[PDB]
Design a protein that fits this description.
Chains A, B: Glycogen phosphorylase, muscle form
Oligomer: homodimer
Helix content of chain A: 40-55%
Assembly: dimeric
Distance between the termini of chain A: 25 Å
Keywords: glycogenolysis, type 2 diabetes, Acetylation, Allosteric enzyme, Carbohydrate metabolism, Glycogen metabolism, Glycosyltransferase, Nucleotide-binding, Phosphorylation, Pyridoxal phosphate, Transferase
CATH topology of the largest domain in chain A: Rossmann fold
PDB class: transferase
Largest interface: A-B, 51 and 51 residues
Number of domains of chain A: 2
CATH architecture of the largest domain in chain A: 3-Layer(aba) Sandwich
Bound molecules: ligand M07
Structural class of chain A: alpha/beta
Number of strands of chain A: 25
Entry title: Glycogen Phosphorylase b in complex with (1R)-3'-(4-methoxyphenyl)-spiro[1,5-anhydro-D-glucitol-1,5'-isoxazoline]
């Protein structure tokens, strides 16, 4: 159909049809008479998978022959989403498969909807890892993603009576055609035990053993025939485990629980033993695999020349003392040499400055679970503090501030401090965030080792986040500037010469309208909800958190509603306000915010006076697959975190690429997005970081805003009195109390500027031509935010490797 | 190579080679450079599996079109063993695959050794189910085996310091290429809850739900293109199960534990809740599947015309009240009609008379777990006892004897009584056993309903137990009488005309010697144990149990040892005495017997005076795959249970088919084996059932035998004094005490006759020609013991269906 989706050659289509039929028969053991849509999906998935295998085998043998430096990306989260369409896109098979299935009497888009998301992440951090894997393969890097194969990913969200309910994400129920179990490469992981000091060093003895079984998933690069590997570990009990008899076999579950479930927390540290076990499990299995591959290329001097380990936040921080453990205790290297190797091998990316998100593990937990690692951490700390003391003599408070060990009620290990000490590079994820690191939380460390600190602004893959989810936009762009931009997003700048082109203005607006129509149809079909496709689609999709200020959005919605009720016969630009996202199950306030959103919708959506002028919808079960649907449909992207709290954001970049305008604070990557597009083409409002600092020094008094803003007072009185909960008048008392007395994120302080800015949004939307011209200026300057740019920077500035766009032989 | 293994055609070999290479590449994602023997096994398994699928699909569609009466074989145990060679044998692919792999530079027999046994059974009962499935497919019956997919089968046995150690049988670790998951046919199973009586009947409410997910395994018939199904259920938690959050997901294990592990008891009832859950789980899921298939052919009058349910012992006895529950509570049939349908549908096979093996479930367990079923059982009991009372007026003791409910300390339900009441046919598994049922334990029931009671003597499949495990013997037979005997074992009678044939005598003895050489080589390679292949191979392999009297064998071994020590320079026929079998983990005496056997070996095998004249070896980890190796190698089969205790035995039949002579009591099928071969061709000794009865009336006094048999006294004194355990003098005190004071199985009473009979065995072995002629007379008369004969009898006399040897189109 469309050019960017590749060729549908007679030979290819014929071969795909026969292999589809072969898999339906031999693999699925079905015939066309009893086969269901799900059977057809699997037949297609197996057919497409077959095209990966040759490339996968030859890529890995190529790395063995060439022996390049290997990049190991360690993460507790990989938010992959669906794999079928992505694989077709990267292999240039989309049009061919569309044709082949059409000739078989099937609709490929219907088949695509059957696949479960691989939801092995919470949101931004896990999705970043996924985009990074795509870019590393596209740039021809010898890269491996290492994580945990959770049996249960992020929970499925159901809304019942306006409240969030959780159910298990049983994503493996029907099988996973993309993974290949590798039980032959199973490795032991040790827990508990005790440390024994001998004539020849320390020994870790009397341990409990859990097996780590790897599953490999292919990661295809964009049309370069490179296929890299994501290796995820699954926990298995040894066969002699606890070996009355029946109970001993049943108790195997205790060991295997390590890989059972993803902790569902976004930007929050939960210091539970099971989580610590997960963190060591991935680190210990991965490091053994790395060392084995290195030895099968004695001389650990060349280790950092052949190995780079990237730590995705502090979650895999145990890699540092584990590497030291192996080099010192097992390989018999002297401490100083082992440390040199460790520092040159490891690098650390920080993803957040929120205090409650930082990992600080109780010493007593590490003492019991990992006694040798605690000893190594103590030794690292002593040698590090000796360096600090030499550099800043007599500065006793600096010593206590910089220590890896924190004293108090319970002694804790600060994992961020451990990571900085044991890495040759430390980076933040957006310019403003990286600067905040050097000025505030890591100031002492920056003063000691300034060369260590870097910035690497986040990005998103334009394969998934443009070509896959928005083929209509990809096509109209390709018509003007060709296809090269898909792996070189900076080429989008060429679209600036089309901002006054009448045909292009028309096509951009047409594609958006089509996306909005399709999404409005999706909502009626799957959720029986009705929306006006002619309204402004105002979208805030992201995890529910106080810092992200879904509450500020709520205040604006109620403001709009109240203004309509005050002057019903006055014209207003119609809006569909859509808010979606999951709350962590134990996060009370986040669950209350969801209830508030649905409660507002219950009032607003059924008021006859409002009509089709304002609709409030909560998007249930926000996940990667839903993002791919709603983002291309959006007109307005809400990026409204309190300045200094969103380290980068990546949803922001997705919206910019897909033709939505942004209303946002100068926070995270928003700053750089506005810099790229020009501030005139961005809807910027609210406090800057400096303004937040000034307010904190003064003391934030929410009452002041309540007293001086009549429209805000009305809303608070409505919430308190039970306007949005008539049967339960005091339902939202917790929300009001927080807003009035203990709001860490200063919702009221940005209210006036936000509402004012929203009026400017509505004004521009009244002028379709000028709206679209501003959209074109955003799309055209979105190039910097490709994860290809991000990964190229990591490669050159941290890993010491050169990216390549050269094809491998097919 | 050999004729019975089929053709190796140029086309077939070429196609097998290319499909092998295709699977290694696409399915396993390997190349010849990194592939291991295990990879090669899987490539072969997938290649052979492909040949099943067409036949499997067409067989099942054929049954849908023809709508024959369906046979449902319900069992908690299916002891399948390995599948690769069996599939090749039944598809006539063995020689072709041997050639194809040879041309690829691989040894197929090496590849076959990689496959794990499917050990979903304890021994005889589970193996009978497996042979039955093979015969039902070979006889073209529309038959389905239904059971549980245990994650862990019968434990692997390790011998450490002469003691049995258990480890988990993680048989699914590397995957199972033979099964096809069918998550789309998942069914709910209900537990606990309460009964609510309404206007329109009873309702079972507030239940806990566990999902039953089916896995299908193909069961190929012998060269008839029929492929039947074994459907095994796996337990899955519903996604809202227990839905803080993390613990709720972890607690899913509680539901899924139902299908985790096989109870490892042979002929013993363990009344645990988990076992009851397993029994209902298989019954509830299976019955829903049966009813669905019946409705997709309202009128339940024709149900028994289209459905037969065979209960493999009382383990699936809950099928009776479950069927009543569905028909009465859900389908709204009147009780009398539902009962008529149930009785005509169900039939019950009893497999044991040992009191400790009979299922008697505490009422309090059924009350809590299955409250509606208990109510139905009470109603069945009342109506049944009303029938008994009408037939035998005033016989109050008969009423209490026949009741399904047993009174006492704890009230129990007698499941055997339930089965007899609710089945139209009840059978024992050998003539002597079926007679014992009518004369003793079920006498009252036989008097009420004589027409119900039948015999169906057990059998074994000649495919696995001759062609597969002993191709050399199969070939020399085929050379004389052709190939038809493989599916018509009665044709072996034609070998009687060759008993004086000098060439045949030579060939039979040659095949045995070759088997003995191969097995002696297997022992050195895998266990570093050395044996004389010129010695008489004296073998007792079966589960360890007091009733099977491994202890009687031990007494003979020590007798032989003592006689050698008394007269060292006197010639004796050299023997290798081999004993193998697993003990149930909680069966103390059985574990003590294993230790005794190894302790005897420790003394006997290292005595320089004995030399190579006597060796005692314990065969570790006895299982189906080991049976296939040792049985063809055996000279003497030990079948020495106390008369009246072994219901049938099936190991006995395996040895007879493979050219071993039998030393045995007149117990189980031994009686019929001797009848078929002639008593002159069997080594019969010991008490008959009548003699055991006489001794019981008198009172068994072991001291009497001790006092009057000097050779027996010597052995007991050796055991007691610590001759076989010098470092632990009193190690075998429990064994001596049991033998002397509480031996239920009268070991001493058969000692003299046993030793005498063993002397006659040695005498005949000294004459190779006459030994072999007697062997030929055994093989020639083994035809009755084919499971094809057994299944044909079930078909005609119980199920009301006609077997067919007609081919389906290929
Ligand atoms: C479980 O602990 C955490 C889970 C998630 C996270 C984060 N999720 O999103 C964050 C940080 O990382 C993204 C990728 O760099 C950034 O774009 C977000 O701004 C940041 O909040 C931090 C800790
Ligand atoms: C767990 O409960 C039981 C397990 C096994 C058994 C049996 N195993 O072997 C038995 C009975 O059945 C075989 C098949 O009919 C017979 O050949 C054996 O003689 C009998 O002991 C009985 C109860």
């Amino acid at each position: 159909q469309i050019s960017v989706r590749g060729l549908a050659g007679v030979e290819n289509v014929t071969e795909l049809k026969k292999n589809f039929n072969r898999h339906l028969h031999f693999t699925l053991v079905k015939d066309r008479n009893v086969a269901t849509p799900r059977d057809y999906y699997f037949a297609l998935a197996h057919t497409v998978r077959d095209h990966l295998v040759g490339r996968w085998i030859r890529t890995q043998q190529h790395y063995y022959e060439k022996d390049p430096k290997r990049i190991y990306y360690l993460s507790l989260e990989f938010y992959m989403g669906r794999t079928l369409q992505n694989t077709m896109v990267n292999l240039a098979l989309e049009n061919a498969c569309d044709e082949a299935t059409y000739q078989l009497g099937l609709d490929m888009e219907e088949l695509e909807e059957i696949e479960e998301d691989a939801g092995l992440g919470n949101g931004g951090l896990g999705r970043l890892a996924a985009c990074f894997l795509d870019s590393m393969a596209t740039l021809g890097l010898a890269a491996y993603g290492y994580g945990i194969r959770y049996e249960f990913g992020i929970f499925n969200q159901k809304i019942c009576g306006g409240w969030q309910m959780e159910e298990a994400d049983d994503w493996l129920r029907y099988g996973n055609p993309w993974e290949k179990a590798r039980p032959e490469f199973t490795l032991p992981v040790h827990f508990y035990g005790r440390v024994e000091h001998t004539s020849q060093g320390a020994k870790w003895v009397d341990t409990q053993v859990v097996l780590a079984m790897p599953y490999d998933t292919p990661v295809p690069g964009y049309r370069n025939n490179v296929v890299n590997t994501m290796r995820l570990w699954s926990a298995k009990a040894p066969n002699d485990f606890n070996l009355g008899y029946i109970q001993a076999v049943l108790d195997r579950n205790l060991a295997e629980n390590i890989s059972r479930v993803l902790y569902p927390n976004d930007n929050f540290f939960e210091g539970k033993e099971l989580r610590l076990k997960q963190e060591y499990f991935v680190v210990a299995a991965t490091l053994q695999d790395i060392i084995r591959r290195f030895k099968s290329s004695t001389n650990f001097d060349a280790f950092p020349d052949k190995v780079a380990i990237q730590l995705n936040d502090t979650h895999p921080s145990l890699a540092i003392p584990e590497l030291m453990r192996v080099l010192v205790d097992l390989e018999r290297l002297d401490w100083d040499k082992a440390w040199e190797v460790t520092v040159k091998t490891c690098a650390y990316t920080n993803h957040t400055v929120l205090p409650e998100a930082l990992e600080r593990w109780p010493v007593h937990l590490l003492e019991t679970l990992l006694p040798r690692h605690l000893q190594i951490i103590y030794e690292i700390n002593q040698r590090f503090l000796n360096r600090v003391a030499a550099a800043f003599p007599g500065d006793v408070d600096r010593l206590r501030r910089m220590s890896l060990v924190e004293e108090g009620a319970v002694k804790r290990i600060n994992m961020a401090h451990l990571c900085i000490a044991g890495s040759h590079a430390v980076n933040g994820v957006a310019r403003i965030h990286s600067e905040i690191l050097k000025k505030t939380i890591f100031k002492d460390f920056y003063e000691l080792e300034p060369h260590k600190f870097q910035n690497k602004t986040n990005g998103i893959t334009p394969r998934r986040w443009l070509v896959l989810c928005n083929p209509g936009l990809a096509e109209i762009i390709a018509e003007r500037i060709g296809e090269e931009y898909i792996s070189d997003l900076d080429q989008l700048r060429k679209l600036l010469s089309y901002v006054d082109d009448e045909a292009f203005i028309r096509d951009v607006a047409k594609v958006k309208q089509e996306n909005k129509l399709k999404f409005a149809a999706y909502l009626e079909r799957e959720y029986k909800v009705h929306i006006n496709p002619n309204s402004l689609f105002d979208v805030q999709v992201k995890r529910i958190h106080e810092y992200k200020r879904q509450l500020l959005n709520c205040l604006h919605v109620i403001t709009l509603y109240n203004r309509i009720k005050k002057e019903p016969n006055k014209f207003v630009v119609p809006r569909t306000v859509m808010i979606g996202g999951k709350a962590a199950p134990g996060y009370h306030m986040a669950k209350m915010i969801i209830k508030l959103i649905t409660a507002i919708g219950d009032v607003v959506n059924h008021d006859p006076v409002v009509g089709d002028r304002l609709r409030v919808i909560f998007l249930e079960n926000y996940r990667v697959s839903l993002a791919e649907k709603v983002i291309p449909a959006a007109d307005l992207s809400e990026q409204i975190s309190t300045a200094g709290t969103e380290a980068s954001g990546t949803g922001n970049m997705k919206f910019m690429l897909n033709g939505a305008l942004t209303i946002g604070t100068m926070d995270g990557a928003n700053v750089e997005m506005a810099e790229e597009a020009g501030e005139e083409n961005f809807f910027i409002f609210g406090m800057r970081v400096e303004d937040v600092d000034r307010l904190d020094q003064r003391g934030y008094n929410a009452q002041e805003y309540y007293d001086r803003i009549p429209e805000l007072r009305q809303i608070i009185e409505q919430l308190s009195s039970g306007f949005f909960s008539p049967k339960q008048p005091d339902l939202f008392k917790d929300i009001v109390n927080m807003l009035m007395h203990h709001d860490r994120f200063k919702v009221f302080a940005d209210y006036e500027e936000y509402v004012k800015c929203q009026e400017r949004v509505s004004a521009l939307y009244k002028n379709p031509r000028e709206w679209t011209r501003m959209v074109i200026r955003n799309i055209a300057t979105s190039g910097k935010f490709s994860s290809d740019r991000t990964i190229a920077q990591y490669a050159r500035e941290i890993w010491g490797v050169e990216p390549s766009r050269q094809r491998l032989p097919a």
